[PDB]
Write a protein that binds this ligand. Sequence first.
Ligand SMILES: *[C@@H]1O[C@H](CO)[C@@H](O)[C@H](O)[C@H]1NC(C)=O
Ligand SMILES: *[C@@H]1O[C@H](CO)[C@@H](O)[C@H](O)[C@H]1NC(C)=O
Length: 539
Amino acid sequence: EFTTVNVNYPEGEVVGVSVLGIESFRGVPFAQPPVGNLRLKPPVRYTENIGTKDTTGIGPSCPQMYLSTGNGELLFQLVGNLINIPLFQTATLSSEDCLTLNIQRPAGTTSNSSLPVLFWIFGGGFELGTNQYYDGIDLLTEGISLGEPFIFVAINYRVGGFGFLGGKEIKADGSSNLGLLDQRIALEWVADNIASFGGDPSKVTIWGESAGSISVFDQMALYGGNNKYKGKALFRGGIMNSGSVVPAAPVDGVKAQAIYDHVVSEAGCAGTSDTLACLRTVDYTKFLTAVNSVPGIVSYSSIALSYLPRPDGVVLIDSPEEIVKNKQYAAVPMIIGDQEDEGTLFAVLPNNITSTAKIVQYFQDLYFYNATKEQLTAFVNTYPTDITAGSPFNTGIFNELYPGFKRLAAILGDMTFTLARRAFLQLCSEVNPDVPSWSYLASYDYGFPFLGTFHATDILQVFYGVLPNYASGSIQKYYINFVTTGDPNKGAAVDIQWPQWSAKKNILQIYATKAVIVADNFRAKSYEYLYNNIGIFRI
Ligand SMILES: *[C@@H]1O[C@H](CO)[C@@H](O)[C@H](O)[C@H]1NC(C)=O
Ligand SMILES: *[C@@H]1O[C@H](CO)[C@@H](O)[C@H](O)[C@H]1NC(C)=O
């Protein structure tokens, strides 16, 4: 029940597969393979035709730092069933030769079509992940069925030490934040070539979850908020699922230099004249071992990440909170939301962090090098020790995995995602009052034991078809409405108007079988501290 289909475009030709009404091209190379003397260097566009490429398979993935299985034993039991969510899946066909994207479109789409584009950036803690497990067929089919067809694009970008390695050596070589540059260059590729595929390059909406979501903000922030390529905006809209501003110390800071020095040592490049140059001569396997030898996300250190975007003064010019405050990001219409219990997943492992003093130490040692004990204690004291006050929110005496679990999960979730979001909306509304934004809180997994509506459960609600509930149809319709009209309420009919955030500072709360509108003001004292002292929270 299928056929192949060729697209000829300015850089080459691809063969894709048409099945179930969707034409898919997986593994379209968008930049030169970052190998040899191009490992730990910015991506560079192809300078000549790549001939005819077979894109009927699944593409490659970038090198991975897979979740610790010895460490996550309990965590992976607690998610049970939902272990089949992409974040927990294992990437296949991994390689340094991974700078490729996937293009999926309605059958019938030709180069005379000009459909809106939806550009997807995966999450994975900046250390793992791939576009392989995010297929557009169900979502495209939904789009088509709403009378609102579009084109789906999903990219790989380098992660871990391959993409976010730092230090003074990386900074001087101009090789900071390669993963971000990978995302950016794919946007410019899209700008050059998507018309050949039937996309309208002036109608690009970027979309991400977790690390991908944070990346979406960074793409707005990139180059002082210059998202223009050849005179034109690279995108017109953003959707942020769990994550935005991540205040951070410089790429040549202490944390990053320590990672770097450790990597050099484990690579066997210690004490050479030019360490960074030497890193590129190391075999792939010895190198992969080096960059993976540092702490992962499933570990005691948890969301004190080893790899992430850090200010370099060119790509990211300042720490993210300052970029907004200085009105130096590309201000586009945006949707941003959180799962209700963002922190739960990350509070599972550190099961000895069981009191205020212990939370504060943990933070002082691993997280915030610029906060004082009095400051951290003051912030932690905005969170009651009472078992009913924590995350999974609104579950009373239940879900206390260990003494202090719900409190720590509340804190971890709030500062990284949920309250950081409100801060972001607040600031954006202050410098760019005219740029509209919409925000939701997700609660459709209320009751999930110990985890509640936890990080990445939204994936299940938008990538796997329209589920037999309220939430998935609701969410997909808003998203597709947005991609099409720049406003989630405009397009296909909706049964509740989603309020613009800046109007009354209300958000949409989405349950499994209904939606309600609520004030974005819960945990106000915690939020006030965070907003008033955001500088001290630089990771
Ligand atoms: C928690 O336990 C770990 C490993 O057992 C240790 O590294 C860390 O220092 C401990 N922190 C506290 C506050 O006990
Ligand atoms: C700490 O604050 C200072 C003041 O500018 C800054 O130079 C330094 O990079 C900051 N470091 C961290 C880890 O926040």
